[PDB]
């Protein structure tokens, strides 16, 4: 196109548009938008989107040539986000393709990498000592070594750089994903790496779902080669709007809901939808995972205060062949939830990390799905299998509400409120009553009691209950509604949670404080004892306390915000005593064995195998001090445990680091 | 612009009381506010031409080194430095409009590099044929290496370290404070670079504030990402107390109205912790005097008094180790939550890192020499670092860190009253074991606490039930369990006011009731409580712990002197942890 015309037609439009801009001149920017721009001229707006190389700049030179006219002479707003910020079609990182390259269009998504904000060498000057030429090369984000072999006037092989003479701009790489909210079942998601400006750079860090918005560009393919997978998307327009495309919708069967919830027996109807009915066997179990899909009140306090009301169900010691990993697809009917195992086949894993980038040399930080589904769910399928650095950080992600990445030495902190419905295989073929949660598991007993909601699934082992009831709902379940009977569908299921967890929020009552606060104490009172030379186990904690609110306000959430809240309170305390009738329970409802690895009556009798130990640690009477023979005959006529039993404890010593051995009978204290 | 006439314009200006008195000195600090007075367009040309308008202001000051009223040696080491500028920069302030621009940035020292030497002048001779060629290199450039000859052109041109001239260099990661600038951004550092009068100017963990010139360094393929933010640092001067003390200026007539009062010691408890807690009153009261301590006093001859009481909250993990720590961090100034076990090197203490782009053992400070009159609120302790273990005895007696690593031997001050508090090394301990030996800490370590609370989840009735209670209406949202008597924003200043102002001393009614309960403990109660070879239950350093503690709550009155009812206060916490 021509040089002048672009020019007269965007300074006819655009004003107001540039004295707002003229009082922040650091700014350097304007809002444009599409319908502004093609109500003035139709043929200008379909103009930039074709071609946006170089009638942008013509466009930022006509808002230059309004400032500098001889009217109004300020030299202030050179450059202009002559992006529009609103536009006629909205691209995704799934639906991108080579067909709209060099051109302008919009991406929505998720950033997963930010990295350092570097200065960008633009207009690099060359002017050498010997020979004096006067020459400037221009140089991209994606060009390395952009420099002449030799100079133009005698051939100079010692050029060098003007720094002072050339622009230097702010520069930071971004990786934009798809975002886990819209897309379904059985899909890949696709990344796409950005690049940030000046007057654009810092704009959202790894987590969050941004908008996109500029010159999508690409690498230069050289002749006789092959094609350059690398595309660079110039972002020029800053904008937050991905959020209101996505989490904000419309809602029409919100009128027909309120019939629905009128009617009795709504939370019972919830669950045999969002579940599969093939799936049976496990009707309170499935409860308190149909709960944990709808999140409680997460209000802001002063001093920093604050209580998270996402309640998090973790199972472990399951079968071979369980349900609950069928369930678990199932589980992603909620709202922003990642369907991912532990294992995440990257070096950031489930927690934010920093990881190398090959595209760009400088140091990015990377977000894992505990990061991007910030404000939603996060389910796992192997929660015990995780890495060693994924381990140290996912202590304060479900904790303190964040990352908390410091290795990076920038220290971003990123956001961590995902609603983990996870699962963990045993590490044994067979699970038992007698063993412990911790025990049985890989994780460390810290992850254990900060879930509000623990559960344990075990078929019968005789034929004669368990064969005669599985696979008859399993046989006549194939082509008939014993597979599958839903009164309302997934996708109008999960419709009503994005209701009830934005507009709805429930309270609960003085009487159904009461509940709460009678029933912790009566339970209290009812497994206390006095320990002998050691302390009795809680059957309560104060931490369980603060989940027992959290199965209130989630039962609440489904009672359409009853202030009376007392009908809710007796069933969030009957799961919450299921979960405690066979968890936590070692002794009297002993909840060490959640909040430690080992239990109350295990770290007893080991304090009573320490009395027969280190009374003759440092006599050596057999091959060492406190010989292995001699102790199993102290611990028997003490009352601490058999000699198979004290053999099963002198190998947990040797494991957690209380007690080695040198050699065979002998068990010295470390 | 021209620099021949620009050292004549200097001459006219050229400050001058300053060079009568710093001619043995290597470092002329010039202020640009008598810059300005002179010429405003020539102050103005330091921040927008830094690399050749200091080249004059080093020239200008052997010219009237040389001039017949004040003439002596000529001395051409004489560093240009401008200490003042008319704007300070920000966290992440420093950008690509600041590069070749001098800006001033302030902040903290994070990490330092060992005395290395620098080649300036970069003498290269050949092998060959033995060409003496000169380059003098920047400090702020990357290292390079000539390709051929002049000569012949030959690969043989290397650096010979006899004709070449050396300047002493050092290297500094220049994180600066988060106090919570920039809306709380996750801070930004920039290295600098230390000149050869400006090297071990300051130490790793003190506040600074340091002008520079941000230049760049070719270290990539891509043109946009080969940047490196280096400081080319012009003068380095520690930070002002008013800008690192907070402001209390508007707050000061409503601490002044609190004194009115009587209940002033019951409303600096409540509202320093939150009020959903509604438990631990006496380790309320324990936290509340650890926040106020005692007085940092310099004892004449070589010597100092320890003014803080670490407060160690050891216990079970349900109670203890759980929000704590959390709402004291938001209170108290310059608190940094920190965890025993942590991915950095440096962790708890200031521990020293070999990694370097020289290879040089760098010094990594850690979070108690950053927390310079802050509170380390450390969460479990038990599972602290080993390195770190060694210097931790240091820090608790003398609040330094001495880390004598390779190429660094100066100390490191702590200067932090920490909180510590550790898991059971077993879990689930009880009183009838004894309490130092059941824990990670060592009994040396234990003394070092003033005080050492104990918190468990008891089965009693009632204690059961004021959780169960407090906890539900939290909840729901009443105001007289969250709300507190006096803001958590009037509080934070009323402790950053009182530790500046008031100090209290000793009077002699206070020093009476200290002689009842010192001999009352230990008549026949010593010889009962050891058993010839058992330790004593108050000793001379448990004094410390007493009198530290009777200034703490003469602090929260802020009534300069101690009495007798002061004193009693502090005997009653003082039993609670020897009993509890």
Known sequence: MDREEMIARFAKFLINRLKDLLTVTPKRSLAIDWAHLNSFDPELADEL????????????????????????????????????????????????????????????????????????????????????????????????????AKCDACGSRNIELDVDKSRFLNFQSFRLQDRPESLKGGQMPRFVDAILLDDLVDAALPGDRVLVTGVLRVILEQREKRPIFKKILEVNHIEQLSKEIEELEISPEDEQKIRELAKRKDIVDAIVDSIAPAIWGHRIVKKGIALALFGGVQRTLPDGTKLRGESHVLLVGDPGVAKSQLLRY????????????????????????????????????????????????????????????????????????????????????????????????????????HKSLPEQLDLPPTLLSRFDLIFLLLDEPDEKVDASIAEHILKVRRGEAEAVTPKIPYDLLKKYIAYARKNVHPVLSREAMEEI??????????????????????????????????????HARMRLSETVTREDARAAIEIIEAMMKTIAVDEEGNLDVSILEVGKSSKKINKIEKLVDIIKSLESEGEFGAPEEKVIEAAKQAGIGTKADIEKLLNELKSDGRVYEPRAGFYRVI
Request: glycine letters at 6%.
């Open 330 to 433: 199932v589980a992603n009917l909620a709202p922003r939830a990642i369907y991912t195992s532990g294992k995440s086949s990257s070096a950031a894993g489930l927690t934010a990390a920093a990881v190398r980038d090959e595209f760009t040399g400088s140091w990015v930080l990377e977000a894992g799905v505990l990061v991007l589904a910030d404000g939603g769910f996060a389910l796992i399928d192997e929660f015990d299998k995780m890495s060693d650095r994924d381990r140290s950080a996912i202590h304060e992600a479900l904790e303190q509400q964040t990352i908390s990445i410091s290795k990076a030495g920038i220290t971003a902190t990123l956001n961590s409120r995902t609603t983990v419905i996870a699962a963990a295989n045993p590490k044994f073929g067979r699970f038992n009553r």
């Open 517 to 554: 606060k009678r029933y912790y104490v009566k339970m209290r009172k009812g497994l206390r004892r006095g320990d002998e030379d050691g302390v009795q186990p809680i059957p309560i904690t104060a931490r369980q306390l603060e989940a027992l609110i959290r199965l209130s306000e989630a």
């Open 49 to 148: 989107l074709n071609n946006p190389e170089e009638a942008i700049a013509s466009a930022e030179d006509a808002i230059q040539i309004v400032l500098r006219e001889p009217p109004l002479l300020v030299e202030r707003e050179f450059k202009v986000h002559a992006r529009f910020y609103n536009l006629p079609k909205t691209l995704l990182v799934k639906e991108l393709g080579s067909e709209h390259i060099n051109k302008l269009i919009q991406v929505e998504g998720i950033i997963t990498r930010v990295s350092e904000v570097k200065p960008f060498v633009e207009k690099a000057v060359f002017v050498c000592r010997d020979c004096g030429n006067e020459m400037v090369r221009l140089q991209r984000p994606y060009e390395n070594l952009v420099k002449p």
